[PDB]
Structure 1
Amino acid sequence: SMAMKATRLAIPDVILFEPRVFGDDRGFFFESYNQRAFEEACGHPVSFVQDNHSRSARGVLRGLHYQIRQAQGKLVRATLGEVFDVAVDLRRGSPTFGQWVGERLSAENKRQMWIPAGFAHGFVVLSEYAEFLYKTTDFWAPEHERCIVWNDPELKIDWPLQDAPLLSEKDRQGKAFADADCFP
């Protein structure tokens, strides 16, 4: 059936991958991506054109981001530390439109999320520092990126936080879900 776990989440097009590890803490190997397993998992062909690597401190929240033109699927993981990663379904006519799912991803649990075109995406850093990396199917373009505010009362995402997040001005100024332009 495979040789890295794939799990459909409450929103079925959002998928959680868990690679099999070979070795232990002193010395290990794992596949962080296999085209065959991945394409068999999500049901269609995918091409990744860009990889993006970032480092953010504790409590930094980046989201909820999405591009309507140059739409992107994103396969996300943590190589250092721990994030809580969130996908919001924004697809015209989706039976789960306006719903969110969230998973803790870390360098320890080695978990990943596939967030297809049509979703908004965000994460908050829970560890002292987190290094986050993702593969996209089209290029990150700021002039096309849109944003829904992290703490929108209608989505009412359950961020595992005890303190206020540290947001950029842009994310602070995120649109309310109500007011958001969504995907055709």
Structure 2
Amino acid sequence: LYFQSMPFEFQKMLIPEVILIKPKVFTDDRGFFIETFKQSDFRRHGINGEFLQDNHSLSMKKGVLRGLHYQLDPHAQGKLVRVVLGKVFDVAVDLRRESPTFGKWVSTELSSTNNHMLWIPPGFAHGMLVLEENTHLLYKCTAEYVPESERYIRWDDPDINIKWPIKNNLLLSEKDAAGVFLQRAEINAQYHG
């Protein structure tokens, strides 16, 4: 019972390079149809670069946390993130050296209920906390996977100080559990504007 006239709403977050996208849901007797991406519209609202790789993660239990992740330059991925089933608390962290918002973060709830999408530009790290069982997270990347370039910052880093709605149990990968603290992170991304 939430109505939007236009096919996409684009909303800049407090870190304005991060963009929350609300697509339009067309309901009928069959079910629904959503346009989830449209280059022409996205490019007019600041979202640039060729999407070279799409990924899909299933997280079976509430409390799965993945992040914080980025690829070193020149393999930095811009990401368009959505949840087709379930719900996540989704986080973008500005890790662009010299950025007036370096080490700051914004969050949004991405779910199969809202069908919201988050644009996380290159220069940022991504983290997500699973809030519903069997959560399917899909994202498009502006650069292809380069495992050697992947870096890992721990979820509970105190300088970043993300307010995770951690309810009870936390399921972490070994790489994420072994995430480093921001102060000893390897970062080459540079702020431009």
TM class, shorter-length: over 0.9
For the residues of structure 2 that align with 1:36 and 1:2, how far apart are their CA atoms? Answer: 14
In structure 1, what is the equivalent of residue 174 of structure 2? 169
For the residues of structure 2 that align with 1:156 and 1:129, how far apart are their CA atoms? Answer: 27
In structure 1, give the amino acid aligned to 2:159.
E
Which of 113, 120, 127 is residue 125 of structure 2 equivalent to? 120
Q: 1:2–1:37: 8 Å Cα contact kept in structure 2?
A: no
For the residues of structure 1 that align with 2:169 and 2:184, how far apart are their CA atoms? Answer: 24
For the residues of structure 1 that align with 2:129 and 2:159, how far apart are their CA atoms? Answer: 19
Say if 1:72 and 1:82 are closer, same or farther in 2 by CA, change over 3 A.
same
Say if 1:30 and 1:153 are closer, same or farther in 2 by CA, change over 3 A.
same
Aligned-pair CA distance for 1:164: 3.4
Which of 2, 6, 14 is residue 10 of structure 1 equivalent to? 14
For the residues of structure 2 that align with 1:142 and 1:127, how far apart are their CA atoms? Answer: 28
Q: 2:7–2:35: 8 Å Cα contact kept in structure 1?
A: no
TM-score of the aligned structures, taking structure 2 as reference length:
0.90
What do residues 102-142 of structure 1 show as CA deviations (whole Å, max 9, x unaligned)? 11100110000000000011101100120000000111222
TM-score of the aligned structures, taking structure 1 as reference length:
0.94
Aligned-pair CA distance for 1:178: 1.3
For the residues of structure 1 that align with 2:6 and 2:34, how far apart are their CA atoms? Answer: 14
Aligned-pair CA distance for 1:42: 1.3
For the residues of structure 2 that align with 1:114 and 1:90, how far apart are their CA atoms? Answer: 15
Aligned-pair CA distance for 1:20: 1.0
For the residues of structure 1 that align with 2:22 and 2:28, how far apart are their CA atoms? Answer: 16
In structure 2, what is the equivalent of residue 134 of structure 1? 139
For the residues of structure 2 that align with 1:147 and 1:164, how far apart are their CA atoms? Answer: 21
In structure 1, what is the equivalent of residue 55 of structure 2? 52
Q: 1:76–1:112: 8 Å Cα contact kept in structure 2?
A: yes
What root-mean-square deviation, in Å, do the aligned CA atoms of Structure 1 and Structure 2 show?
1.6
In structure 2, what is the equivalent of residue 89 of structure 1? 94
**Secondary structure in 2 aligned to 1:178?**
helix
Gaps of 5+ in 1: none
Identity %: 53
1:139-158 equivalences in 2 (<5 Å): 139-158=144-163
After TM superposition, where is structure 1 displaced by more than 4 Å over at least 4 residues in a row? none
